[model samples]
Each structure stands twice: as structure tokens, then as C-alpha cells.
Target: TKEQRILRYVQQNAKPGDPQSVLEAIDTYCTQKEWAMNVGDAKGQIMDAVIREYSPSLVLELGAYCGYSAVRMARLLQPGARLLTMEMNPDYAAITQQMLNFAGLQDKVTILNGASQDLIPQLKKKYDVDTLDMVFLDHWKDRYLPDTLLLEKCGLLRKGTVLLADNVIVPGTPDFLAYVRGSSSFECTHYSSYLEYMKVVDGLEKAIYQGPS
Candidate 1:
């Protein structure tokens, strides 16, 4: 299987405890070998810059595919920062855990295995925080709007909280785009780029939470 092959590739190729090397190796495998759905190096750079700029202490990632972006963002987060990532697929969750472990980021990330709709509310008590510092949305595109609304409804999006959503242009997420752009409480911007590992067009939407309407 592709997932197992990726695991073996990382284990055999990437150096243990070295995230950058591991990422580079994964990118190499994805580019020259197999095409992975993980957010590739292109948009990943944009995401990396945002994470470094914000230096968020608490982050939420909606999808943990192959743990590529999780390892990418977790490495930039400041000491003591935490990233909570959710993946609906248990198999992927296991693979992600292994990847994070290889990257020496196990201490910085927690993988929640289940539907985001069921796990988000639990986060309120788990972290004992009223709001999240940042959120990365890369799950099923259809889940974007509802999960975002849930975050808002849960009072998890505070003033200045950042939201970054991928695959908004390639596959396209009209409802999510419309809500964020039309909502008065969010300041939205789009970064034009190509889709992961492809020359075709795609983009990432970054929105800053401006508080309740």
C-alpha cells in the first residue's frame, strides 16, 4: 500500500529526530516517486511562514494526512507550543503518529482519532482554553464550513485567531469561501499557488478572526 510504502521510505531514508531532513525526504518521495495528498512543499511554505510569524501556542489541524503538514507546522511552533491534529482514518492516524515520532515531534503534537465534529467540543476541556491560536483546514472540503461554524459556536475562535484552508481553488470550496469572505467578522486573503505536486491552479485562504458580529 502507498501508506506503508511511505512509512518504509521515511524509516529507511530520513534521519531520526531530524524533521527538516524527514520533510525533505518525504517531498522527494512524493515528487519523484508517488503522488501524495499531503500538502506539498509549495503551499507548505506559505503555511510555514504563517506559523513562524504567529508563533502560536495552541494550534488545531483538521486533517492529519500522512502527518506531513503536522510535522511541518509542529517544527516551527515555539517551545511548549502544542498542535492538536484530527484524522478520521485510524490507519492514517497510526501512520501519522509514526511519522511524527520519526520527526521527534511526538511531544509537540497530539493526534485525535475520530470525526472532527465529535472531537472539537472535547478540546474545550482537554486544553482548558477558550480559544485556539490557529487552525489549519485540510480535511474533506465539505466539512470546512460546518466545522468552522462549530468552532465559532463553541467560542473557540477569538479575536486574531488565524484560519488557513487548503485546496480552496483546485477542487474549490464555494460555500466556505463565500462565508469567510462575506462575514464581517473575518478579514480574508487568498494566496494564489499551484496544487500539491502539480502545475494546475490552486490557492490557500487565510482568515483572521475579528470577533463576534
Candidate 2:
């Protein structure tokens, strides 16, 4: 409700066209001009609740559209903890980096400009991210299940690590939902909330999972 109102206020004022510019504009809009819903305001509250409940040490986030989500996580993270966020779009990564720097949270978040599949190896090589304490998946809906499996095989998650995946109901990620339902390796719970900037039947869903140790 309030988040939707804030989102609308930001979008209405957003400079349209380029995704990078739009994201930067939105970040500016959120911090100075206006407040926007970028999963950081509402959905981000859900994320924060889960993270605080779980108390993760190393958080891996898939998708860095403009670092809004990462910024939210960074705010809640314990000092010295780091968040590695993947950005498929390099331009968005650059824009997000600039915005994070402007916000003075650049040191807490790292923007990796590459598909998670390609960069996971490098991440492991550099950070030894074999046992990720938490993972926030908000990227490609269709690829969610496959990518989770890949991450499993890559040893990115330790036993009992928490996984928070967004957008399973509104935009819909059925395959991933089904996979989690059938897998004995995971224990999951679904959270539903109103979508940002939408008056229609639009809403968002998150699937929180705990992996088998």
C-alpha cells in the first residue's frame, strides 16, 4: 500500500527509455527526489526479516538491477559481512556501482558483471564461496530451478543455508516452485504480498528454502 504509493511516485517521475539510466534515475529518485519500490522497500522488508531470522554470514544475491536489493541487505548485514550480487547487464552494474558509491555503501556490495553461471567459478576462486550462507534469487524466472540445481552442484550452499527466491507468483516461476515442492532436499515456505506500483491483480511471492545439510 504505502510501498506501492512510493513506487508510483518514483515511476511517474522516472526518466524513461534506457534501463541503466532509468535505474540510476530511480536510485536518485529514491534517495533524494522520491522513494521507489525496487524490492528494497517492501519485498526488501521480507528479505530483511528472513535474513535476520536466519543470520547468514555470506550472502549471495542473483540480480543487481540497480543494487537496490543489495543496498537493503547491506543495511541489515552484520559489519564485515559482504554481499556478492550478479548483474547480467554490464551497464546496469556500472550504474548500480555508481549509485552504491554515491550512497556510501559500495564497500559492502560487489557487482559482478556476468551471468551467475559464468561468474560462479570466478567467485568461488576468489572468495571460496563454496558454502554460501544465504542466497537471494531474483533474476530469470524460467531459469530459477536450473540455476539453483547448478548452484547446488557447484557447492555454493552449505547445509541449512537459507534461500530466498522472489517473483514466483506475479510474474510466475512455476517450474521452480514445483521443483522445490518435490525435492526432499529442501524445506520451503511461501510468502505472498502486494506488488509494487500495481493496482491490478499484480502481487509478489517469495519461496524461502532451507537446504539439506
Candidate 3:
């Protein structure tokens, strides 16, 4: 699998406990060697800016394919804050766990190996989450709409919970956009950028949850 190859490269070339090195190694691999699904440098910077702006304590990531975004967000968190990531495939989840370990971010991230649909509802009950300060949706495009509503219904999202979604143009979610952009309960904004490592137009949508009814 490509993730295995990326993990191998990350383990071999990236310095132990150096999160930036791990990301750079993965970036180099994707840039010079092969193109994978991890978020690239451009939108990554945007995500970094958002995380910095909010400084969320408890963050949720819907799809942590390779843990690149996990590390990127984890590195910026305040001490003792954590990011919870969900991945359906056990194998990919295992790989991302190693990737985070290699970056020495095991303390900052906890991955749940299961479907978001099953895992999300349990967030408040099973995971003991009160309110998520932020959420990063980088998973399947189709789930983008459904999961947003699920998150809302689960009561894990409160006033001003920031939801940043990736791949909003190259493989965008229109219904998701319609919900957030049109609904008065949410305030939506778009950040324009190109697709990862290429000129294909893609971007991220930042939707702020206003509050419950």
C-alpha cells in the first residue's frame, strides 16, 4: 500500500521525535517521488493558520489517512491538549499511529480505528467529549454532508466550533456547502487555493457553527 511505503520512508528518513522532519519527509516523498492523498504544503499552511487562530484544545479529525494533518495540528496545540482522529481501516489506522509515534506526537493525538458514523455518535457517550473546539473533515467526500449533521445532532458542536473541510473544489461537496453556506445557523467562508502539489483548483471551507436551536 502507498501508506505503507510513506510510513517506511517516514520511519527511515525522518529524525525520531521531530514532527517537522516527518512532515517534510512525507512532503518530499509526495513531491519528488510519488503523489499520495495527504494534504500538501499550500492548504496545510491554511490549516495551520486556522488552528493557530483558534488554538483548539480538543480537535476531531474525520479521516487521518497518513496522520500528516494530525501531526501538523498536534504540533501547534497548547500543552496537554489533544486531537482525536478517526480512520475506518484498521491497517491505515495502524500506520497513522506509527507515523504519529515517529513524530513523537503520541501524547497529543489519539486515533479511533472505526467508521466515523459509528464513532461520532459515541463521542459524547463513549469518548466523554463535551464539546469539540474544532473539526477537520478530510475523509470521503460523500460523508461530508452526513457527518456534519451527525456532529450537530450529537451535541458535540457548540457555539463557534470551527469546521474546516479540505478538498472543497477538486472533489468538492456541494450539498455540504449548501447546508453550511445557506443555513443561518452556520457562517461559511471559503479560502481559495490549488490542489495538492498541482495547479488544479481546490480549496478549504471554514464553517463556524453558531449554536443550537
Candidate 4:
């Protein structure tokens, strides 16, 4: 219902083929109206900076909540680069599909309908992925560490691969933080910011994979 209302707002306020305006419409609605878990405006700049600088060719996002971050990331992708986002809920996936379509970013992003654990193993066989340049963890909190380990097992991470995880403080993934920060394979950085659309303290963890030790 929240996503449907967001779609209605986007339909009313956002211009087709304009991802930024679509973003604006959602931010406007969320800020002035109702709150959704779409990555809020403050943290989005950090995500934007990372995406723009890293210039990832194949990006994977673990969550497709309302497709807000998907549109955010897809809009910034270089030509021919693509983002594969996973969402277990078909309804959210459908809503995200419409959002990306409305943003004219259908080419830049493909929404994979499955749980992260199920789909992480399929990247090499079904999706033809050698390795991911960037992985954004925004799904359930506890999944951050396990999926990272699974990605490693699947040979989906390489040197210089960046894993950016959200909500690491509030409803934080302490285990993930401990593992990623302690592991020699990753160089981790914490970006301090508030939780999505709220004043509560939260942050994103930028852990660059330096190849397995």
C-alpha cells in the first residue's frame, strides 16, 4: 500500500524518463507526507559518490525496497553498465519494475525476483557474472555477513570490489561489522549519517574487497 501510494504520487508528479524527478517526487512525498524505507536524501549522496567514483560495470543490490535505491543507482550507471537488484517479494519487485520503467531506466537495471541466498549462487551460471564490482547490502540486517561469505564462495568478488552496507548502526549488523572490519580481505570504511528519512543515527559501511587472504 505504501509503495502503491508512492507510485501514484510518482505518476502524478514525476516526469517520465527522468530518474532524478522520480527521486524527487519520492523524497518529497516521504519527507512531507509518509515515511518509507527508501534510502534517504543524506545517505544517498554517499551512495552516489561511491557509484560515480567506483564506476562499477556489474553492480548487485541485495534489496529492491520500493526500488528507490535501484533508481538512484541505475540513473548514475555508465553506459552499458547494469545493476541487478534482488527482492524476494514479487509485489515489491513489480512496484520497483514500474518505478524503473517510469524513470526510463529499464535498460540500466534488472530486478531479480528471489531471496539473496538463493540468487547469489546463480550469478555465475544463470547470469554470466565473473565478479561484481560493487555490492550494496540494503535488505534484511542479518543477511549482510552471510551473503558476503556466499559471494566469496561463488567467486563473485575480486580485488577492488566494494561492498556498501546500509543501516549498520541502528538495527545494526554488528556481526557483519566485526567480520568485515577484522577480515584481511576487506578494507572497511564507515560513513556516518542518519537513518533513512529519520533523525536516528545510522551509517553505511564501505568495505572494499582486497581479494581473499
Candidate 5:
């Protein structure tokens, strides 16, 4: 119901075919009206900058909440680049599809409906993705380490692939953080920031895969 309200808000307020407008509408709705789990503006800028610098052709997003980051990231992708986002909730996935459609970014993003653990392997086969250029992790903090390890096992992570994880500080992903920081195969860095829609301190972790151990 809350998610549907967000869709209505965007459809009523955001201009069609204008991704920025739709993004702003969603942000305003989330900040002033309802609290959504989407990555907020501050961390979004960090995500944006990294995407631009890396210019990845294939991006994998572990969670797609109402398609906020999907729209945000897909918009910045170089032409012919693609973003495949996975969301476990069917309702959220439906809303995300609508949001992407409103922004006219449907062609750039593909929404997968299933658990990250189940869908990631299928992604490898469907896309024939031997290496993923970038991965955005916004799912359950607990899944962070396992999914990353899975990526390694499945040969999805290549040298220089960047892993950007949100909510690492808010909820605190100690195991994932430690694994990346202590591991020699990764160059991990944390950006200090605030939690989504709050003044509380939080941060995003950027870990680049150096190679296989």
C-alpha cells in the first residue's frame, strides 16, 4: 500500500521520460512523506561517481527497492550498458517495473524476481556473465558475505570489479567488512556518511576485487 502510494506520487508529479524528475519525486516522497529503503541522495552521489569513473558495461544490483537506485544507476550507465537488479518482493518488483517505465529506463534495466542466492547463478547463465564490472549490495546485511563468496566461486568477479555496499555502517556488516578489509584480494574503503533519511551516522563500503585468492 505504501509502495503503491509512491507509484501514484511519481505518476502524478514526475514528468514522463524525465528520469531526473522521477528520481527527485521519489526522493521527496521518501524523505518528506514516507520512509523507503532506497539509497538516499548522499550515498547516491557516491554510487553515481563510482559508476561514472568505472563506466561499467554490466552492473548487478543485489536489491531493487522501488527501483530508485535502478533508475539512478541505469541513467548514468554508458550507452549499451545494462543493469540487472534483483528484488525478492514481488510487490516491490512490480512497483520497480512501473518506476523504470515512468523514467523510460525499462530498456536499460532488467528486474529479476527471486532471492539473490537463487538468481545470481541464473544470471551467470542468462547473461553469460563471466565477469561483472560492478555490483551494488543493498540486500540483507547477512547475505553480503555469502553472496560475495558465491560470486567468487561462480567466477563472476573479475579483477577491478567494484563492490559498493550500503547500510554497512547503519546496520553494521562486521563480517563482510572484515572479510573485505582483511582479505588481500580486495582494496576496501569506507565513506563516512549519514543513514538514509536520518542524521544518524552511517557509511558505504567500496571494495574492489584485486583477483582470486
Candidate 6:
């Protein structure tokens, strides 16, 4: 019932050729129809809050699944700020790109179809993205900690940049969670909540882990 309602909302509201529209479609489907693996609307709002709080100059996202999170980040970033998002799956990248265009955020958000681990050097050369104000990790769960370490090594994050990891406690990233908890360089905070737009019975937990560089 709720899931159907969400799906209907997304499909009906999604604009043609827009990344935000794809996100809306996904949100509608996952919340109303099928179980969507991508981060849906509710937790996405939490991400928006994080962006608003940080007010960063440059934001980078490690995953751009259907561009849901990317558009959300775009909505929160300061006017004229740039967002670079990497997606390993080219098909998903295209979908996200289309959705972004639909949402009128294509100018501000760049969807790169490459893994962060492999493109750090290229991105540095191409965009001079050496320092990030905000980093969002929503890609391969296993790569979370390693990717953060990689960013650190490449000097892509400033001393006090905010790093956020979604679905930390759900489909899970224990090592990343542990690393944030155990490391001194990071001052971490966790925002725990249920699944997006779902009833309380599912017992899903979405965590927003943030800290310094």
C-alpha cells in the first residue's frame, strides 16, 4: 500500500530526461512497489541536511546510482558550487545524467562513469579537485574505508571536510564504521534511522557518519 503510493508518486512526478526525475521514480518504486537498493528519499533528506550544515564549496560523491543522491546534494550545495560524482556503472551513470538534466541540475552536477579508486589522479588533473568540502560514499560497501584512505592520500579532502557514509548499518560497512570510530583524525557522528518512507516494522537503519579530514 505505502510502497504503491510511493511508486505512483515517483513515476507521476518524474520529469522526462532528468536525474532528479529518475530518483523520484526510484523512490516511488522502492517505497511503494519493489525494494530499491539505492538510497531513497527519506535518508536522502538527511544527506541534504548534512550538505546545508556544511555549506561546502566543492562536494564529491563516490556513487551516483540513478543520480538520486547527486541531485539531492545539488539541491543543497551553495549556488554556483560544483559536484563531481563517480559511478562505476555506465548505464546507471546515463540514467543519473538524464535525471539531472530533467531536474535542471545538469550544469552543477557532473556524473563521471568511473570508480573513484581509479580516477583520483585523472580527476585531480582534469578538475583540480584536490580539496573536497564534502564527500559522500554510497558505492561499494567494501570500498568505503579504503576509498576514504585513498582520498586522504591524494589530498582530496581538506583538514575539516565533512565525509558522509550512507547505509552504513544496513547493507552495512562495519570496517568503515570501525575505522571512523577508531581513528583519531576523524571526529565521527552517526545519525540512525529507519528505511526511507517505510513503516517501522522493516527495522532498517540508515546511518549518516560524518567527520573531519
Worst ten in a row by lDDT for model 5: 193-202
Encode model 1's per-residue lDDT on 1-213: one tens digit a residue. Answer: 898899889999999999998899889888877888988889999998888888899999998989999999999988899999999999999999999999999999999999999999988897676789999999999999999999999989999999999999879888999999999989998988788776444599999999997
lDDT of 5 by residue, 77-134 (tens): 8889999999999999999999999999999998999999998878767866778999
Q: How many clashes in candidate 1? A: 0
lDDT tens digits, residue span 1-213, model 4: 988999999999999999999999999899877888888788999999999999999999998979999999999999999899999999899999999999999988888999999988888899888989999999999889999999999889999999999989988999999998999999999999887676445599999999978
Model 1, residue 61: what's the lDDT?
97
The 0-to-1 C-alpha lDDT of every candidate, in the order given, reads 0.92, 0.72, 0.91, 0.92, 0.91, 0.77
Query: CA shift at 185, candidate 4, in angstroms?
Result: 0.9
lDDT of 6 by residue, 151-191 (tens): 88887877899998988888899999998899999999988
* Candidate 1 residue pairs in backbone clash: none
Error of model 3, residue 55, in angstroms: 0.6
Local lDDT at 65 for model 2 = 74
Worst lDDT run of 10 residues, candidate 1, spans 193-202
Any idea what lDDT model 6 has? 0.77
Candidate 6 residue spans exceeding 4 A from truth: 1-12, 15-25, 197-213
Pairwise TM-score winner, candidates 2 and 5: 5
Would you estimate the TM-scores of all the predictions? 0.91, 0.76, 0.91, 0.92, 0.91, 0.82
Better model by lDDT, 3 or 6? 3
Clashes of 4: 0
Candidate 2 lDDT at 7 equals: 39
